[PDB]
From Swiss-Prot:
GO terms for cellular component: extracellular region. The gene is tst. GO terms for molecular function: toxin activity. Responsible for the symptoms of toxic shock syndrome. It comes from Staphylococcus aureus. Belongs to the staphylococcal/streptococcal toxin family. This is Toxic shock syndrome toxin-1. It is found in: Secreted. It comes from the Bacteria. The chain holds residues 41 to 234 of 234 of the full protein.
Length: 194
């Protein structure tokens, strides 16, 4: 049996993420952005962190690799609105897609990856990297599904030695999220399930 916190995390990381490329900025105020997607929908995205406050101005193009906070709505005016959190980056692509070095250990023993995607974007928000890492863990490695896989961490080590890390027993700390990083500067990503 697992506790209620672990159940919320299983629901959160087992659903998917929203992906929109080449969207256009309509408005950008403190803590949010109103974006128009190519398919005609509108995205209302919140940015709770003072360290990651997108500075894109009206008219600029951006990419979305984000998560919805609630069900989308059809309004009176007939617009389709998405409610998402974080995940806005520039539209730059890498010369050729790369494979991010992810090594996973479950109870100290190595656990091989299955369906770990390649990435063609130059920069990804840290919350998006968090979603991808944890999603692979819940779908392929059993994270949050039983009581013996409820904690651990993931750690990204950059070429200069600086690191980013998240505790798997808690939801990603959106309120203190750091700015998006260039994925081609990541030396290693390790994930351990206790």
């Amino acid at each position: 049996s697992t506790n209620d916190n672990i159940k919320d995390l299983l629901d959160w990381y087992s659903s998917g993420s929203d992906t929109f490329t080449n969207s256009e900025v309509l408005d950008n105020s403190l803590g949010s952005m109103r974006i128009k997607n190519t398919d005609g929908s509108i995205s209302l995205i919140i940015f709770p962190s003072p360290y990651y406050s997108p500075a894109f101005t009206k008219g600029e193009k951006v990419d979305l690799n984000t998560k919805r906070t609630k069900k989308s709505q059809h309004t009176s005016e007939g617009t389709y609105i998405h409610f998402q959190i974080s995940g806005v980056t520039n539209t730059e692509k890498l010369p050729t897609p790369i494979e991010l070095p992810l090594k996973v250990k479950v109870h100290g023993k190595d656990s091989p990856l299955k369906y770990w995607p390649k990435f063609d974007k130059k920069q990804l928000a840290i919350s998006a990297l968090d979603f991808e890492i944890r999603h692979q863990l819940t779908q392929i490695h059993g994270l949050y599904r039983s009581s013996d896989k409820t904690g651990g961490y993931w750690k990204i080590t950059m070429n200069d030695g600086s690191t980013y890390q998240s505790d798997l027993s808690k939801k990603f700390e959106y309120n203190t999220e750091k700015p998006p990083i260039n994925i081609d500067e990541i030396k290693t990503i390790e994930a351990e399930i206790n």
